[PDB]
Structure formats: structure tokens, C-alpha cells
Amino acid sequence: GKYVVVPETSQDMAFKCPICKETVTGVYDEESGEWVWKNTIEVNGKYFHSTCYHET
């Protein structure tokens, strides 16, 4: 259930999931006060859906 705060260096707030090919969008959570990418993990400098990584 870990989430990653949407990178401000990308400025598009999205990345293309290479494993199942969905465009990953993120939402601003007003309670935590940050943009969220949930079920997401960074592997070797790239962000992937954490759910998808297990298939590889």
C-alpha cells in the first residue's frame, strides 16, 4: 500500500507502464498534501507499477 509522491521533475505527472502498457496517472491527496502514485515502485531509476514488477 506504499505510494510514491508524484515527481515534480517530470511535470507531466504520468509514466507509461512498460509491463502492461497503461499510462499511469496520479492524484493529489489533500490529506497528505502530496501527489500520489500508489502501487508504484522505483526500480533502477525508473518508476513502475509495483503490482506489475512481480510478473518480471
Backbone φ, ψ for residue 39 (5° rounding):
55, 45
Shortest distance in whole angstroms from residue 16 CB to Zn ion: 9
Rounded least distance, CB 43 to Zn ion, Å: 13
Enumerate residues 14-43 that contact Zn ion by CB under 5 A.
Answer: 17, 20
Candidate residues 3, 6, 49, 50; the one interacting with Zn ion per rule CB under 5 A: 49
The contact set with Zn ion (CB under 5 A) reads 17, 20, 49, 52
